[PDB]
Amino acid sequence: EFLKPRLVDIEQVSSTHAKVTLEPLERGFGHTLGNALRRILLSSMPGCAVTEVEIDGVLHEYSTKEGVQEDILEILLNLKGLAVRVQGKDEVILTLNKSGIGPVTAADITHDGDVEIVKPQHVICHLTDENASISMRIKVQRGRGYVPASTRIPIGRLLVDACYSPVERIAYNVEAARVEQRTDLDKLVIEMETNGTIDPEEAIRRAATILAEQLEAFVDL
Amino acid sequence: SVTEFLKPRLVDIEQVSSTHAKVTLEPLERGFGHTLGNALRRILLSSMPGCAVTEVEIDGVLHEYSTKEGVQEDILEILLNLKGLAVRVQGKDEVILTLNKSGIGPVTAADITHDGDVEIVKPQHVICHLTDENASISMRIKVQRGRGYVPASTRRLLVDACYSPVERIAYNVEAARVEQRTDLDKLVIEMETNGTIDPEEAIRRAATILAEQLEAFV
Amino acid sequence: EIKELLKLGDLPTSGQIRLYDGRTGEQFERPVTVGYMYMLKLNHLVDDKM
Amino acid sequence: ARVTVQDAVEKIGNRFDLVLVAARRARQMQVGGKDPLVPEENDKTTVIALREIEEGLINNQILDVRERQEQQE
Amino acid sequence: QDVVLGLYYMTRDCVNAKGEGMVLTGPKEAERLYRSGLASLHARVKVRIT
Amino acid sequence: REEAVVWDILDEVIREHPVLLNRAPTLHRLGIQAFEPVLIEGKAIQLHPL
Amino acid sequence: KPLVGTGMERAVAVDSGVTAVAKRGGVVQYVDASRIVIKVNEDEMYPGEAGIDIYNLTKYTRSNQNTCINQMPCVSLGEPVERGDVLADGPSTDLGELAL
């Protein structure tokens, strides 16, 4: 008796955010599916965030390297906001090297096939000395939500708080949709906002799969 | 590691009465109690199919503000009692029933002349009280299938159509603990039905509907 | 001056916008006051008092 | 599973005597033997005793007579 | 404080509101209307109460 | 060492074991009140508003 | 920075000894997380011993209330500066402006 919603198009506005329009829906389901999908998306999406850093010339995050404009703490806080996606294995170690005067952008990291960088213009630290080199090993892990470094627990390691969730903000609106002779149908438009590491269609399908798997317990009651 | 979640493990159904039951789920992921609770509530309140009375024809009175001899009560309470009547019809979208009564005696739902298709769950429901011996009362009742709740103003006197079998749905979210994790959510659903179907079954229906809305994605 | 500054942007002059409930998705019955305010963290931490 | 003591206070004269008799019964139940007269529901000893008081099957004189009967052995 | 404001906003009639003048079976229905959005939280109605 | 069974034992021993909550100054006899504690996270004593 | 302020933030930040203020104008020859070197402009050298100016910042030094005192350079390499201009904001300061 009810109708079946399905994806209609994926309108891309920028490399970070896009919108999804749904097949026309019955009354009462515009705000029922929309809010559930928004909650799932903002709650539990997979993420590929940085966890630990290993800079050669430091012992702790409260020190200062020579020739680097920013403190080690600022370097960590800039690395925490690095957007990266992996394909093969859940964890990977990235290598960074730079020398001479100039900013140390994320494009200077190695270019392994599975690991992809979506923001090559991201700036980690500045080099102000004529002959100063920075060499760090960045560890990237896959997870969900926000796992603080003070709970998941040598001396050369520096732990960085992990913010896995790729979606930044999700909005939706319900507007009248014209199809067949029914004037009681509407389409749900979801405008989402990623850091650039997840495809909107994949995120929507994952959220719907999670919701259906959760409801499978109720349907068995 | 990243895909699995924490499915509910303890489900307790406490049937305090025939049509009132409480369902508790534990545990759920943090924030998943509100999502499921609100989805189920919004589906049950205004999207669950059912059949109920939609309009009533009375020969004696032609307007809502009118008086009929022989009845100690008003027309409005008769309309309320017809509105509160719970009826199940299988396969027939629209049915017309004829009610005839006479003499002193409390009119009940069992006195309604109905076919085999039409079944009344509560024959003990008091449609109206008649306190005159010579009095005679006659009604035509229209029962239709539909979904949700339809006010009379949105739409032979009109009756508010309570298509949805539910009568009251409400959910509470509490804190449940598993191992060293305490932030997990526990859902408690308290539900009452008009009598057409038991609360345990109706909830299932709601879930099914929502699942049927996610077939094209999974 | 505050109203003129608000009108320069794309914000309502009254300063009250219409929010939504996060958990239920239902609109709040009245508009509420939303804006940016400067918060300080005083030197009375609970972990030094428990 | 005990949220108020109104029934126990009404059953006995005053609250202080209720406290004393409940303490005596709970100590009898806790230190040795003296299985409860009411089916426990994973309740602490101080709670099982109080229910026994509100059921009317335990008060000062009942405890006194049981103690006398047992000490007569 | 917070409780008093909520109970004062709940029990306070308005001369014109959504779904006014309709007659309800009882208190249980009044909750189904307010949640469904078919009637405002405070509209003058006629209900049957035991 | 904060094992896992210790938490279950602690939950067991706080079934109906009242604790006396107190605020200085305790001007009147209602400044000391008994409660049944509930095991929660954090480092703050959650108090009933009423 | 405070979005709504009063204009006394600059005065309070400069007057307190938490921001490294250049004694003489010049150009930042070398900037680092723990030192700033200013090559004084031609008009400001004394007749003898022209030299340069060197400011050494304090990094993560314990305060009286067990808080952390830390200074960060706020100027870029090869940037002109003048006398009285902040070269390194201290604790609770954003570009020579109080921010608590």
Curated annotation (Swiss-Prot), chain A:
Domain of life: Bacteria
Its EC number(s): 2.7.7.6
GO function term, MF aspect, one: DNA binding
Main EC class the enzyme belongs to: transferase
Outcome when changing R178C: In rpoA101; temperature-sensitive
BP GO annotations: bacterial-type flagellum assembly; bacterial-type flagellum-dependent cell motility; cell motility; cellular response to cell envelope stress; DNA-templated transcription initiation; intracellular iron ion homeostasis; nitrate assimilation; regulation of DNA-templated transcription elongation
Entry keywords, A to Z: Acetylation, ADP-ribosylation, DNA-directed RNA polymerase, Nucleotidyltransferase, Transcription, Transferase
Region of interest called Alpha N-terminal domain (alpha-NTD), as start-end residue ranges on this chain: 1-221
Post-translational modification: (Microbial infection) ADP-ribosylated on both alpha subunits by the phage T4 protein ModA. ADP-ribosylated on only one of the alpha subunits by the phage T4 protein Alt.
Reactions performed catalytically: RNA(n) + a ribonucleoside 5'-triphosphate = RNA(n+1) + diphosphate
GO cellular component: a single term: cytosol
Family named by the database record: Belongs to the RNA polymerase alpha chain family.
Physiological role: DNA-dependent RNA polymerase (RNAP) catalyzes the transcription of DNA into RNA using the four ribonucleoside triphosphates as substrates. This subunit plays an important role in subunit assembly since its dimerization is the first step in the sequential assembly of subunits to form the holoenzyme.
Protein name: DNA-directed RNA polymerase subunit alpha
Annotated organism of origin: Escherichia coli (strain K12)
Lineage, opening ranks: Bacteria, Pseudomonadati, Pseudomonadota, Gammaproteobacteria, Enterobacterales
Swiss-Prot record, chain B:
EC number, as in UniProt: 2.7.7.6
GO cellular component: a single term: cytoplasm
EC primary class: transferase
Processing and modification events after translation: (Microbial infection) ADP-ribosylated on both alpha subunits by the phage T4 protein ModA. ADP-ribosylated on only one of the alpha subunits by the phage T4 protein Alt.
GO BP field: bacterial-type flagellum assembly; bacterial-type flagellum-dependent cell motility; cell motility; cellular response to cell envelope stress; DNA-templated transcription initiation; intracellular iron ion homeostasis; nitrate assimilation; regulation of DNA-templated transcription elongation
Region (Alpha N-terminal domain (alpha-NTD)): 1-218
Signal peptide: none
Transmembrane segments: none
Keyword Cell membrane: no
Catalyzed chemical reaction(s): RNA(n) + a ribonucleoside 5'-triphosphate = RNA(n+1) + diphosphate
Keywords: Acetylation, ADP-ribosylation, DNA-directed RNA polymerase, Nucleotidyltransferase, Transcription, Transferase
Complex formation: Homodimer. The RNAP catalytic core consists of 2 alpha, 1 beta, 1 beta' and 1 omega subunit. When a sigma factor is associated with the core the holoenzyme is formed, which can initiate transcription. Both the N- and C-terminus interact with different regions of transcriptional regulator CRP. The rRNA transcription and antitermination complex (rrnTAC) consists of RNAP, NusA, NusB, NusE (rpsJ), NusG, SubB, ribosomal protein S4, DNA and precursor rRNA; S4 is more flexible than other subunits.
Family per similarity comment: Belongs to the RNA polymerase alpha chain family.
Swiss-Prot record, chain D:
EC number(s) from the headed UniProt entry: 2.7.7.6
Keyword tRNA processing appears in the UniProt entry: no
Biological process annotations from GO: bacterial-type flagellum assembly; bacterial-type flagellum-dependent cell motility; cell motility; cellular response to cell envelope stress; DNA-templated transcription initiation; intracellular iron ion homeostasis; nitrate assimilation; protein-containing complex assembly
A single GO cellular-component term on record: transcription elongation factor complex
Catalytic activity reported: RNA(n) + a ribonucleoside 5'-triphosphate = RNA(n+1) + diphosphate
Function: Promotes RNA polymerase (RNAP) assembly. Latches the N- and C-terminal regions of the beta' subunit thereby facilitating its interaction with the beta and alpha subunits.
Subunit field text: The RNAP catalytic core consists of 2 alpha, 1 beta, 1 beta' and 1 omega subunit. When a sigma factor is associated with the core the holoenzyme is formed, which can initiate transcription. The rRNA transcription and antitermination complex (rrnTAC) consists of RNAP, NusA, NusB, NusE (rpsJ), NusG, SubB, ribosomal protein S4, DNA and precursor rRNA; S4 is more flexible than other subunits.
Listed name of the protein: DNA-directed RNA polymerase subunit omega
Taxonomic source organism: Escherichia coli (strain K12)
From Swiss-Prot, chain G:
Post-translational modification: Acetylated on several lysine residues in the presence of glucose.
Range within the parent protein: 697 to 796 of 1342
Biotechnology and industry use: Co-administration of salinamide and rifampicin or salinamide and myxopyronin suppresses the emergence of resistance to both antibiotics.
SUBUNIT field: The RNAP catalytic core consists of 2 alpha, 1 beta, 1 beta' and 1 omega subunit. When a sigma factor is associated with the core the holoenzyme is formed, which can initiate transcription. The rRNA transcription and antitermination complex (rrnTAC) consists of RNAP, NusA, NusB, NusE (rpsJ), NusG, SubB, ribosomal protein S4, DNA and precursor rRNA; S4 is more flexible than other subunits. In pull-down experiments interacts with CedA. (Microbial infection) Interacts (via flap domain) with Escherichia phage lambda antitermination protein Q; this interaction renders bacterial RNAP resistant to transcription pausing and allows it to read through termination signals.
Protein name: DNA-directed RNA polymerase subunit beta
UniProt function note: DNA-dependent RNA polymerase (RNAP) catalyzes the transcription of DNA into RNA using the four ribonucleoside triphosphates as substrates. Resistance to the antibiotics salinamide A, salinamide B, rifampicin, streptolydigin, CBR703, myxopyronin, and lipiarmycin can result from mutations in this protein.
Domain of life: Bacteria
